[PDB]
Amino acid sequence: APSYRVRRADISGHGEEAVVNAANAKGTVSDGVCRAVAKKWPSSFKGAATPVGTAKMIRADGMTVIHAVGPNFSTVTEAEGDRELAAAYRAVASIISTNNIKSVAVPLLSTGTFSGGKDRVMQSLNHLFTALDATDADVVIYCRDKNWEKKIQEAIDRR
């Protein structure tokens, strides 16, 4: 069975075997998780472009980087975004299980730039749990907000 922890820290400082980038479909560097990932593992972005609702893995700079593209909720209906966000997390879970990845640092996809101006912490976290429950990985969820850290910890505990 998988294990879940939350850290309020820069995800670039994670101690896990792999890291999930909250990526865009074009594989460009922009504000958010992506900027921290690009600074720490700059060569991890070579050929990383992948469609919304999918994930693409690379080994670069001594790290396993999983580029997961959540939906931009400004560009899809709520129901379409919900399906695509579930799909991105399942694509992450598949990469974890098929590559025997023991531990992974994961941000909450579609909760920043792609949030469409809405609070989607619980929506994104619930899809993270559902998808990564299919793995036996040690999952560490990364955030920067003290409020988010507490709600994520509350959610982990309820399980």
Stretch that binds ligand APR, among 43-51, 55-63, 91-99, 139-147 (CB under 6 A): 139-147
Looking at 113, 133, 136, 153, which residue binds ligand APR (CB under 6 A)?
113
Which of 85, 91, 106, 108 forms a contact with ligand APR (CB under 6 A)?
108
Calculate the CA 114 to chain-centre distance. 12
Give the amino acid at 119. D
Is residue 23 a contact residue for ligand APR (CB under 6 A)? yes
93 belongs to the binding site for ligand APR (CB under 6 A): no
Question: Going by DSSP bridges, is the β-strand pair 63-68/103-106 parallel, antiparallel, or unpaired?
Answer: unpaired
**3 vs 30, which CB is nearer to ligand APR?**
30
Spatial separation of the C-alpha atoms in residues 9 and 144, rounded to whole Å: 6
Short-list 93, 125, 95, 97, CA closest to 109: 125
Q: How far is the CB of 1 from ligand APR (least distance, A)?
A: 25
11 counts as binding ligand APR under rule CB under 6 A: yes
Q: Applying CB under 6 A, does 22 fall inside the site for ligand APR? A: yes
| Residue 24 found at the interface with ligand APR (CB under 6 A) | yes
Half-sphere exposure of 74 (CA within 13 A, CB side): 7
Q: Is 107 one of the binding residues for ligand APR (CB under 6 A)?
A: yes
DSSP string computed for 9-41: S-GGG--SSEEEEE--TT----TTHHHHHHHHS
Please, which of residues 40-59 interact with ligand APR by CB under 6 A?
none
d(CA 106, CA 20): 5
Task: Using CB under 6 A, list all residues that contact ligand APR.
Answer: 10-12, 22-24, 30-34, 36, 70, 107-115, 142-144
